[PDB]
Structure 1
Amino acid sequence: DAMDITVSIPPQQYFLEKIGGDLVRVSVLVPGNNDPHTYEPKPQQLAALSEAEAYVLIGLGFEQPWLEKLKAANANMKLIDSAQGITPLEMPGRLMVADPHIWLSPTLVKRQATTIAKELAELDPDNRDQYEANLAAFLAELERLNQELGQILQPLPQRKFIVFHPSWAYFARDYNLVQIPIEVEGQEPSAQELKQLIDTAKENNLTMVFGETQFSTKSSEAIAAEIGAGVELLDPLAADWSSNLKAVAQKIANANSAQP
């Protein structure tokens, strides 16, 4: 019957569905409207883990906060580090911690899905073919999306974009963009740092402040007001992954192109 796999975030469900089809029944630990960095799994969720045949970790220390509770919920549960074999980027803040947001890189997702499929075929060999097949289809979908995002951003005069939460480092890396984070987690306590950001923005004529759906937009609205730019939201946990990245790229493009 359908194999019960659990994942940390909505985007992973997208990948598991593409790879597993009706052979998997995916459960998500962190809701899309929540900040996974300060998320605490609920008791009902820990209880349900006893049925999970495996759990797909994002890796790179993303699940560290509840990593142990997971093993305690089920030691038999196979932990799938979907980030293995990938060279990570350093976090914007402290330059000695890996950046976990690799699920927003189409190219890197190819690797993530490949690790998932390989692992699903080990627990359920009979369907090894459907997994490898679904994987191939998905990969090709990825290269397509990758190429599509490239034609939207490549010609953009402006390569920098201001974000609240720094969750697009890997995405901005693939398409030669630079995210300027409003939030930090261990950098310089310079209370005026946000002022340097505003002046840099004004001089480069940045026209938009991209806040994240999972966080308050207060500080982004203020920043934007001061820079004279607009405020838009990007949803890094959107379940509708593929279509979401395209909308994102499109917003970037509308903001980083010669303006009216």
Structure 2
Amino acid sequence: KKVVLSSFSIIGDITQNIAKDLVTVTTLVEAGNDSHSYQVTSADAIKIQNADLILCNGLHLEETYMKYFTNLKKGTKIITVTDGINPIGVSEDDSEPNPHAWMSLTNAMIYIENIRKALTALDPSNAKKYELNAREYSEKIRNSILPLKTRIEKVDPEKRWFVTSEGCLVYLAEDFGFKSLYLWPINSRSPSMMRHAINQMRSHKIKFIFSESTNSDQPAKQVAYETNASYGGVLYVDSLSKPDGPAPTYLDLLRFSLTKIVDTLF
């Protein structure tokens, strides 16, 4: 049985849905851990050796631990599952890519398709199954998320702002035609951006700001006060929740966070 290692929780869940136990899917950065300076353990090095295929996000999400993906099993490739996705930079201009591409309905289809392509190249005798599984999963995602999008699109163009703590929704904003405001581009803080956000909020009379599940709510709350906006609560973007939590799968993560956003905009 072939082994496929996913760099983190969201990618392993996607892969599990496409492969459905035709391969053994593993995860390096498990739910509740962040990729920025994640400590690759000894046990993780075994996962790395056992991999026949390794699936990364790219967009520099894995930058601090890519160096552990060496001395690999002969023939094991590293696939970046965000191929074909036009990156969004972390600056205002030439800058580092924002990694949060999976927070998008369109992109979910690209992750899935890239992962299907690679599983099929790895294990061609099961091609017909990956193809079926991938279509079903895509439909499944679309069915759960399109109604949320449809409702989001009923907002008038002046009132469409995704304000967060981390710049986690820049791709959703582009996918759905919103603009995104936030405090810092990636978890790991500056006063100028806080100042900028407060100004933009006031000018566009923005009513809500969110924090997220792997960061502090203190800044969002403080900015809510300073703008006379409301704190919108916690979104799930950077990691799947633990199994009792509200976002234990990729589909559930998309659904929970877009649901929370849409219920806040209405």
Give TM-score scaled by structure 1 length: 0.87
Aligned twin of 2:225:
225
* Rounded Cα–Cα distance in structure 2 between residues aligned with 1:143 and 1:22: 23
Aligned twin of 1:24:
23
* Rounded Cα–Cα distance in structure 1 between residues aligned with 2:77 and 2:153: 40
Which of 229, 238, 250 pairs up with 1:241? Answer: 250
Corresponding position: 1:214 with 2:223 = no
* Paired residues for 1:23-172 under 5 Å: 23-72=22-71, 74=73, 76-92=75-91, 95-157=94-156, 158-172=159-173
Runs of 5+ unmatched residues, structure 2? 241-247
Deviations 1:207-246 (A, max 9, x none): 3221121112222222223233124111112242212222
CA RMSD of aligned residues (A): 2.3
Taking structure 1 as reference, are residues 163 and 74 closer, same or farther at Cα in structure 2, changes over 3 Å only?
A: farther
Q: CA deviation at 1:144?
A: 2.6
Aligned twin of 2:243:
none
Taking structure 1 as reference, are residues 162 and 85 closer, same or farther at Cα in structure 2, changes over 3 Å only?
A: closer
> Which sits farther off after the overlay, 44-53 or 144-153?
144-153
* Rounded Cα–Cα distance in structure 1 between residues aligned with 2:149 and 2:208: 20
Aligned twin of 1:181:
182
The answer as to whether partners of 2:162 and 2:173 remain within 8 angstroms in 1 is no
The answer as to whether partners of 1:59 and 1:82 remain within 8 angstroms in 2 is yes
User: Number of aligned pairs?
Assistant: 253
3-state SS of the aligned residue for 1:26?
strand
Runs of 5+ unmatched residues, structure 1? none
3-state SS of the aligned residue for 2:10?
helix
Q: CA deviation at 1:95?
A: 4.1
**Percent identity among equivalent residues?**
21
Taking structure 1 as reference, are residues 219 and 73 closer, same or farther at Cα in structure 2, changes over 3 Å only?
A: farther
Higher helix share: 1
> Which sits farther off after the overlay, 123-132 or 38-47?
38-47
Q: CA deviation at 1:146?
A: 4.5
Deviations 1:31-80 (A, max 9, x none): 33233233232222123211111110111222222112112354543211
